[PDB]
Amino acid sequence: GVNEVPDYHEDIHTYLREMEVKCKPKVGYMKKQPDITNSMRAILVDWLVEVGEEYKLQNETLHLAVNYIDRFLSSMSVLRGKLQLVGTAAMLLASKFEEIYPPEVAEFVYITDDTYTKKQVLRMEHLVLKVLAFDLAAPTINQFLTQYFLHQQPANCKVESLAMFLGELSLIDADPYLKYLPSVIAAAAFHLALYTVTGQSWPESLVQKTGYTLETLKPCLLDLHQTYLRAPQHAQQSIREKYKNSKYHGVSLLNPPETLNV
Amino acid sequence: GPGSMENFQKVEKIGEGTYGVVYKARNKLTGEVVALKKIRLDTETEGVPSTAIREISLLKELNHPNIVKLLDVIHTENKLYLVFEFLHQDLKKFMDASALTGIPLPLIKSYLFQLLQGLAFCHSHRVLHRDLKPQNLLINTEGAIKLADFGLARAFGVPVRTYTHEVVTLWYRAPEILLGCKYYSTAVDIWSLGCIFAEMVTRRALFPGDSEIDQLFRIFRTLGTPDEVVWPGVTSMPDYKPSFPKWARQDFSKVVPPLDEDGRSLLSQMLHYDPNKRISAKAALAHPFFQDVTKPVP
Ligand SMILES: OCc1cc(Br)ccn1
Ligand SMILES: OCc1cc(Br)ccn1
Ligand SMILES: OCc1cc(Br)ccn1
Ligand SMILES: OCc1cc(Br)ccn1
Ligand SMILES: OCc1cc(Br)ccn1
Ligand SMILES: OCc1cc(Br)ccn1
Ligand SMILES: OCc1cc(Br)ccn1
């Protein structure tokens, strides 16, 4: 299990828990954004999802980009006309950090329909770097999920894929999800996926690891269950389309449960 | 942030990296001596290099006595300067210029102990180094040694995903990389420290191959050609070939003859074929080889 770093998984989990509190965006920065809204952010994130599937980027890269965007919008006011430029530079930065083979800058320009220039993307790249002070090794929902997956008895790929979709769905809707930590959304996502596929519940072994119980997860879990019920109707549909693909076991086609018994 | 190039006085060039030159400089207000790594962006067409983004982001969060310290990052005009703490020499220059009659065993023992501390701290902070070699290990005048050059380093997840292939300078590269394995982990850094351990004793590289296959062959001639018993899965690995010559494992006392029993024990566990059996940095700190350890000066 060296691929699962037995000698370091706890040290790592503890550290990510510390780092998610330090890298957290301001819940409700949108109220203080004069010209942009949650609905605009949702459009951007949904687009970033399509960009990632087009360039066959990792899920981690998406998660990082959203992280960078949220933290950036926490201190910088942005006109709606520049919101995409921010997202574009976020996606470039995350790709250079996490992708074996990042897309070239020219390709990031291309996906913006020549709204922006190569010069604009690069100057924004520098701005985001400055605003984040290069703090780019941020914990994601996804980093917690992959560790939670080690606690399956036994491993189920439908469970894994369904958890990543739900966690991904959360990235779209800053309200409410900005009020939860990655580690908590991942927990809710994992339990809901597990309950949906196998009827089972958040394992005691993960209670030990995380300190979280169904009690502590309940609020986030009630929201995620709604997001899941309502997902066929959401204005943004890119994640559902993505998760129809075999790569992800077609999990967006699974029916959500009507109730949780929580 | 806390600094501008107005307050640095260049002293002399000290080296060269992939994206520029390193200088030794002096802070003119505090007296502090530093290493400036200049990275040029003016002559960059894809914005800030991914190497620098990783180096900076990962070093920011690794505060530890055996990891060189990133003190600052300055963006002047068209330029990006990394300010690092200053160490006088790297391990390779010391084995080549001051280890003619050899490195004394206390000093090998102290250095390996400190390297393991630094690497354990890396691994506990989801970071693989992926270029541990003596050139990238910096020594001071007080007896300290520090992991350096994080330009090939990478933040990992648990479990690990497929990362970049063919990482690690060849002489220091682990068999699982040479055999093209889908996944590699923290054990690749231990393999490197193992080669380095041996190299401190002999002052010569342990497996100086001139190609991937020659590297494998040299490893196999020393440690024996691995099979399913010593390393389950090896025969099904992407670049494993059945035609591989089947060399017998030579008695380990013949690989590094000056090494005592404890040393051999430790080294054997650093160079285990199976990455699952290979010792971690964390477990290695307790190995009896370090029982009597101190921190003497170069
Ligand atoms: O709905 C308004 C809007 C959203 C984005 Br993202 C970009 C431009 N305009
Ligand atoms: O280039 C596609 C696109 C992205 C956004 Br954000 C808004 C509208 N269209
Ligand atoms: O992008 C960082 C982030 C996003 C959400 Br949705 C919740 C918490 N943190
Ligand atoms: O002072 C600004 C700064 C310092 C470091 Br270390 C890394 C990035 N930015
Ligand atoms: O003023 C520019 C500069 C460059 C170096 Br390298 C050191 C100090 N100052
Ligand atoms: O050669 C690169 C380097 C040298 C020193 Br000294 C410190 C940090 N980085
Ligand atoms: O390049 C020489 C070589 C020999 C063998 Br056996 C396998 C691969 N390459």
Q: What count of Cα atoms within 13 Å lies in the side-chain half-sphere of residue B220?
A: 20
Q: What count of Cα atoms within 13 Å lies in the side-chain half-sphere of residue B264?
A: 12
User: Could you state, in order of their start, the residue ranges of all structural domains in chain B?
Assistant: 5-88, 89-298
Boundaries of domain holding A41 = 25-137
Instruction: Please give the single-letter amino acid code of residue A162.
Output: L
B153: nearest CA in chain A?
A97
Q: Rounded distance, CA A71 to CA A94, Å?
A: 13
Take residue A118 and report the two structure tokens written for it.
Answer: 């190569």
> CB burial class (10 A; 0-12, 13-18, 19+) of residue A258?
exposed
Indicate whether A100 belongs to any domain: yes
Residues A91 and A153 in one domain: no
Residues A126 and A149 in one domain: no
Among the three residues A116, A137, A158, which one is the final residue of a domain in this structure? A137
Residues 6+ apart with CB under 8 A from B229: none
Residues A164 and A145 in one domain: yes
Report the DSSP pairing between strands B20-27 and B79-85. Answer: unpaired
B260, B232 in Cβ contact below 8 A?
no
Residues A147 and A248 in one domain: yes
Q: Rounded distance, CA B22 to CA A5, Å?
A: 35
Among the three residues A107, A137, A167, which one is the final residue of a domain in this structure? A137
For B5-88, CATH gives 3.30.200.20
Q: What count of Cα atoms within 13 Å lies in the side-chain half-sphere of residue B97?
A: 7
Residues 6+ apart with CB under 8 A from B77: none
A121, A109 in Cβ contact below 8 A?
yes
Residues A20 and A146 in one domain: yes
Q: Name the one residue in this structure whose structure tokens are 């479990």.
A: B159
Among the three residues A95, A113, A137, which one is the final residue of a domain in this structure? A137
Indicate whether A111 belongs to any domain: yes
Residue of B158, B161, B187 lying closest to B174 (CA atoms): B187
A232, A191 in Cβ contact below 8 A?
no
Q: Name the one residue in this structure whose structure tokens are 């701005």.
A: A127
Does B227 count as an annotated binding residue? Answer: no
* Fold exhibited by the domain B89-298: Transferase(Phosphotransferase); domain 1 (1.10.510)
φ, ψ of residue A213 to 5 degrees: the values are -120, 175
A207, A213 in Cβ contact below 8 A?
yes
Take residue A162 and report the two structure tokens written for it.
Answer: 């369904």
Nearest-atom index, ligand 5, CA of B6 = 1
Residues A91 and A201 in one domain: no
B141, B297 in Cβ contact below 8 A?
yes
Q: Rounded distance, CA A22 to CA A34, Å?
A: 26
This structure's resolution (angstroms)?
A: 2.4
User: Residue with the nearest Cα to atom 2 of ligand 3?
Assistant: A67
The Cα of B275 is separated from the nearest Cα of chain A by a number of Å equal to 7
The Cα of B28 is separated from the nearest Cα of chain A by a number of Å equal to 25
DSSP labels, chain A: -GGG-TTTHHHHHHHHHHHHHHTPPPTT-GGG-SS--HHHHHHHHHHHHHHHHHTT--HHHHHHHHHHHHHHHHH----GGGHHHHHHHHHHHHHHHH-SSPPPHHHHHHHTTTSS-HHHHHHHHHHHHHHHTT------HHHHHHHHHTT-SS--HHHHHHHHHHHHHHHH-HHHHTTS-HHHHHHHHHHHHHHHHHS----HHHHHHH---HHHHHHHHHHHHHHHHHTTTSS--HHHHHTTSGGGTTGGGSPPPS----
Q: Rounded distance, CA A128 to CA A72, Å?
A: 7
Nearest-atom index, ligand 7, CA of B244 = 6
CB contact B7 to A (< 8 Å): no
Inter-chain CB proximity B45 and A105 less than 8 Å: yes
User: Residue with the nearest Cα to atom 8 of ligand 3?
Assistant: A178
Residues A68 and A19 in one domain: no
Take residue B51 and report the two structure tokens written for it.
Answer: 């190497």
Residues A222 and A242 in one domain: yes
Residues A131 and A161 in one domain: no
Q: Rounded distance, CA B23 to CA B25, Å?
A: 6
Inter-chain CB proximity B73 and A134 less than 8 Å: yes
Which numbered ligand comes closest to the C-alpha of B214? Answer: 7
Take residue A108 and report the two structure tokens written for it.
Answer: 């990031």
In what side-by-side order are the strands of the sheet with B70-75?
A: B8-17, B20-27, B33-40, B79-85, B70-75
Smallest Cβ–Cβ distance between B185 and the set A2, A96, A134 belongs to A2
- Of these residues, B72, B96, B131, B189, which one is catalytic? B131
Q: Rounded distance, CA A80 to CA B167, Å?
A: 42
Indicate whether A3 belongs to any domain: no
Residues A147 and A253 in one domain: yes
Indicate whether A60 belongs to any domain: yes
A130, B53 in Cβ contact below 8 A?
no
Report the DSSP pairing between strands B137-139 and B127-128. Answer: unpaired
Residues 6+ apart with CB under 8 A from B3: B27, B71, B72, B74, B83
For ligand 4, the distance from its centroid to the CA atom of residue B74, given in whole angstroms, is 7
Please give the method by which this entry was determined: X-ray
SS (H, E, C) chain B: CCCCHHHEEEEEEEEEECCEEEEEEEECCCCCEEEEEEEECCCCCCCCCHHHHHHHHHHHCCCECCECCEEEEEECCCEEEEEEECCCEEHHHHHHHCCCCCCCHHHHHHHHHHHHHHHHHHHCCCEECCCCCHHHEEECCCCCEEECCCCCCEECCCCCCCCCCCCCCHHHCCHHHHCCCCCCCCHHHHHHHHHHHHHHHHCCCCCCCCCHHHHHHHHHHHHCCCCCCCCCCHHHCCCCCCCCCCCCCCCHHHCCCCCCHHHHHHHHHHCCCCCCCCCCHHHHCCCHHHCCCCCCCC
Q: Is A27 left (phi over 0), alpha (psi -120 to 50) or beta?
A: beta
SS (H, E, C) B115-153: HHHHHHHHHCCCEECCCCCHHHEEECCCCCEEECCCCCC
> CB burial class (10 A; 0-12, 13-18, 19+) of residue B298?
middle
Nearest-atom index, ligand 5, CA of B23 = 6
CB burial of A33-53 (b: ≥16 within 10 Å; e: otherwise) equals: beebebebbbbbbbbbbebbb
CB contact B110 to A (< 8 Å): no
Q: Residues near ligand 5 with C-beta < 6 Å? A: B 5, 8, 10, 23, 25, 36, 38
Residues A238 and A155 in one domain: yes
Q: What is the CATH number of the domain that holds A57?
A: 1.10.472.10
Residues A203 and A231 in one domain: yes
Residue of A192, A206, A201, A205 lying closest to A160 (CA atoms): A192
Q: Residues near ligand 7 with C-beta < 6 Å? A: B 213, 241, 243-244
Take residue B248 and report the two structure tokens written for it.
Answer: 């017998």
> CB burial class (10 A; 0-12, 13-18, 19+) of residue B265?
middle
Q: Rounded distance, CA A226 to CA A215, Å?
A: 18
Q: How many domains does chain A have?
A: 2
Take residue B240 and report the two structure tokens written for it.
Answer: 């494993």
Smallest Cβ–Cβ distance between A2 and the set B46, B50, B276 belongs to B276
Q: Rounded distance, CA A51 to CA A108, Å?
A: 9
